[PDB]
Design an enzyme around this catalytic site. Structure first.
Site, PDB file in Angstrom:
ATOM      1  N   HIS A 167     -30.610  10.166 -44.132  1.00  0.00           N
ATOM      2  CA  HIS A 167     -30.521  11.980 -43.572  1.00  0.00           C
ATOM      3  C   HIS A 167     -31.759  12.490 -43.690  1.00  0.00           C
ATOM      4  O   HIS A 167     -32.400  12.247 -45.156  1.00  0.00           O
ATOM      5  CB  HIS A 167     -29.269  12.584 -43.686  1.00  0.00           C
ATOM      6  CG  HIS A 167     -29.751  13.926 -43.401  1.00  0.00           C
ATOM      7  ND1 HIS A 167     -29.436  14.125 -41.663  1.00  0.00           N
ATOM      8  CD2 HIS A 167     -29.748  15.479 -43.536  1.00  0.00           C
ATOM      9  CE1 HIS A 167     -30.009  15.390 -41.770  1.00  0.00           C
ATOM     10  NE2 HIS A 167     -29.500  16.379 -42.931  1.00  0.00           N
ATOM     11  N   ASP A 177     -28.208   8.464 -38.164  1.00  0.00           N
ATOM     12  CA  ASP A 177     -28.161   9.363 -39.320  1.00  0.00           C
ATOM     13  C   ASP A 177     -26.995  10.098 -39.616  1.00  0.00           C
ATOM     14  O   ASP A 177     -25.336  10.234 -39.099  1.00  0.00           O
ATOM     15  CB  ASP A 177     -28.786  10.773 -37.984  1.00  0.00           C
ATOM     16  CG  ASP A 177     -28.456  12.195 -39.257  1.00  0.00           C
ATOM     17  OD1 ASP A 177     -29.762  11.750 -39.341  1.00  0.00           O
ATOM     18  OD2 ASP A 177     -27.992  12.788 -39.458  1.00  0.00           O
ATOM     19  N   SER A 223     -33.716  18.289 -39.913  1.00  0.00           N
ATOM     20  CA  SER A 223     -32.560  18.953 -39.282  1.00  0.00           C
ATOM     21  C   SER A 223     -32.185  19.978 -38.942  1.00  0.00           C
ATOM     22  O   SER A 223     -32.451  19.964 -37.558  1.00  0.00           O
ATOM     23  CB  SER A 223     -32.068  18.591 -40.632  1.00  0.00           C
ATOM     24  OG  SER A 223     -31.210  17.649 -41.961  1.00  0.00           O
TER      25      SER A 223
END
Ligand SMILES: NC(=S)NNc1ccc(F)cc1
Ligand SMILES: NC(=S)NNc1ccc(F)cc1
Ligand SMILES: NC(=S)NNc1ccc(F)cc1
Length: 344
Positions: A287, A243, A145
């Site tokens: 994710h 995502d 991330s």
């Protein structure tokens, strides 16, 4: 378990001035080192950062960090959980600078908060050299991330750091997971927040990318498809095609308009990866991947991510039966049967 070490240079700090740090588990029979950058959004002005300090304090301060953390996924030391690098030296670097790992600004009479992400990485590297990193053959800088974007912003700076310190033999590489975003149009009515953040953080981007986009336009270098071509270190890109953080920013939470929007997002992401030779991009709504214990579950064209990473290692010494570029071509979430279904 990985054990906490607070930085010996106490002037390299989290947002609130407390010392930054790292968690370490050594493997003295291995010359491989994995340094993982945690994620968790960012903050871009006084009021937004004050809110984060109330309810996300571990991302802004080391005062409450635990003494140990369990290594999971690519950070696991068990062969069954981590077929790729189970015997490596493992490092987890907590994200406590709220700056996508870009900042180089100290707290002062003029700044309520310190934004030191880029300097935290450099200081971790420096202090690990005395703990065994000086003997390394490969340093893999990984992250998820905001940490995945941080890999793209910092991998070449780590390579330059080690060269100038006298360790030209250590091979620096990057692994960016869930950090490859598109500056696309929203489905219903983000780049301005990055622009403002860079000024607030005194943020730094890689020099070749900076020279392309020039003054005032450094925000472009936070987008993987624009910064990646400028990098010299080998970088493997892991990215779900749909995502959840991308969809959140795009205001997507199915009729024809939204069907076309989702299909177009997948098409554009796939296009940006066409010239990325080391990549793993499954057609799933999810994710993050690399520190989830069940990361061995997903496959593209019959190949798992740990296998693809092993094939990448071999390529850096095409390979028969050992692919490194794996991007789904089917156009809708879960058209790949190995996508996650719920969570554990
Ligand atoms: N949040 C940002 S800068 N989206 N970019 C974008 C905005 C409009 C458009 F037609 C295409 C792309
Ligand atoms: N509030 C929800 S779920 N999405 N909207 C949104 C959330 C964060 C952001 F940076 C931009 C837009
Ligand atoms: N949620 C289910 S079914 N598996 N978990 C998982 C699957 C794939 C991956 F990349 C990470 C975790």
């Amino acid at each position: 378990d990985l054990r906490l070490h607070l930085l010996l240079n106490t002037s390299v700090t989290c947002n609130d001035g407390s010392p930054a740090g790292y968690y370490l588990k050594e493997s003295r029979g291995s010359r491989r080192w994995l340094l993982f950058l945690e994620g968790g959004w960012y903050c871009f002005n006084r009021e937004n950062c004050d809110s984060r300090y109330d309810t996300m304090r571990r991302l802004m301060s080391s005062r409450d960090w635990p003494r140990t953390r369990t290594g999971t996924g690519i950070l696991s030391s068990q062969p069954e959980e981590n077929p790729y690098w189970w015997n490596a030296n493992m490092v987890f670097i907590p994200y406590c600078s709220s700056d996508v790992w870009s900042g180089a600004s100290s707290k002062s009479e003029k700044n309520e908060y310190a934004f030191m992400g880029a300097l935290i990485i450099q200081e971790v590297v420096r202090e690990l050299l005395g703990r065994g990193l000086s003997g390394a053959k490969v340093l893999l800088l990984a992250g998820s991330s905001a940490g995945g974007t941080g890999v793209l912003l910092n991998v070449d700076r780590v390579a330059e750091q080690l060269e100038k310190l006298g360790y030209p033999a250590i091979q620096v590489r990057g692994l960016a997971d869930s950090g490859w975003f598109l500056d696309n149009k929203q489905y219903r009515h983000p780049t301005e927040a990055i622009r403002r953040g860079i000024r607030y953080w005194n943020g730094v981007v890689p020099e070749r990318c900076r020279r392309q986009f020039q003054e005032g336009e450094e925000w472009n270098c936070f987008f993987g498809y624009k910064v990646y071509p400028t990098l010299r270190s080998p970088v493997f890109v892991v990215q779900w095609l749909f995502d959840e953080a991308q969809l959140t920013v795009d205001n997507v939470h199915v009729q024809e308009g939204l069907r076309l929007y989702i299909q177009n997002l997948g098409r554009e992401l796939r296009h940006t990866l066409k010239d990325v030779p080391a990549s793993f991009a499954p057609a799933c709504l999810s994710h993050e991947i690399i520190i989830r214990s069940h990361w061995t579950d997903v496959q593209v064209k019959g190949t798992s991510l740990p296998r693809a990473l092993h094939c990448w290692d071999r390529s850096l010494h095409p390979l028969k039966g050992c692919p490194v570029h794996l991007v789904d071509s089917c156009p809708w979430p879960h058209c790949n049967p190995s996508c996650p279904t719920g969570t554990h």
